[PDB]
Amino acid sequence: DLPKSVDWRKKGYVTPVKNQKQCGSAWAFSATGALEGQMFRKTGKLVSLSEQNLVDCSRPQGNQGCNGGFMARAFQYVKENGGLDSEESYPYVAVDEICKYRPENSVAQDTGFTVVAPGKEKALMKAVATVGPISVAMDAGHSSFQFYKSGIYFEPDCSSKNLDHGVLVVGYGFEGANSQNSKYWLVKNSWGPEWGSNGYVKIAKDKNNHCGIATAASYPNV
Predict the structure, then answer these.
(1) How far is CA 56 from the centre of its chain?
(2) Residue partners of 18: CB distance under 8 A and separation at least 6
(3) Side-chain half-sphere exposure of 103, counting CA atoms within 13 A
């Protein structure tokens, strides 16, 4: 009984597209994006969250800052730390720096996170429909993705198991009148608004877990 389409951007859950620049911090942007949606669902206030706070401070939890990391380890950091600072108060500079977490500037918290049944696009569809934006890993390691500009993205060389890039599923939809025709996942990237379609990409949906979008999906518990 899930909706034919979902787009959380239309309900105020999603901040404008950000840019990680030359830092392997996509996992931090995916995590802040999912926490931004859950915090909005809880309080009605959309507050941009600090990726730099995660880059600089979550090494104990197993992240490696600009050398990579994982969204579940970032949600683990926010839980163990008791908070996460706003983007305004702890700005992004795209380089590993000293941890400067300030509890008085915290605007978010989580108690851990929930994992979507791995490899199941229908499970991911249910989480997107009932929770809000969901953090996901994908295989983005292709020039077709770097130069992606519009339309549904399908890449034959995509893997659903060996992934390399965290992104945020903000909804799903279809092209035209038939809800089961030309389906896609609405994905927010962190390569800036100029990349792709206003910083977003439509990834083919119900095409065998294309690019691994439902392989490692999760969301923070607020």
Answers:
(1) 19
(2) 29, 51, 92, 190, 192
(3) 4
Which CATH code for domain 15-220? 3.90.70.10
Give residue for tokens 């978010």. Answer: 108
- Strand 152-153 and strand 200-204: pairing? parallel
Q: Are 1 and 43 in contact (CB under 8 A)?
A: no
Q: DSSP for 36-93?
A: HHHHHHHHS----B-HHHHHHH-GGGT--TTB---HHHHHHHHHHHT-EEBTTTS---
**Structural domain spans, the chain:** 15-220
Experimental technique used to determine this entry: X-ray
Q: Which two tokens stand for residue 189?
A: 């990237």
Nearest to 147 by CA among 94, 66, 201, 214: 201
Residues near 141 by beta carbon (within 8 Å), at least 6 away in sequence: 164, 165
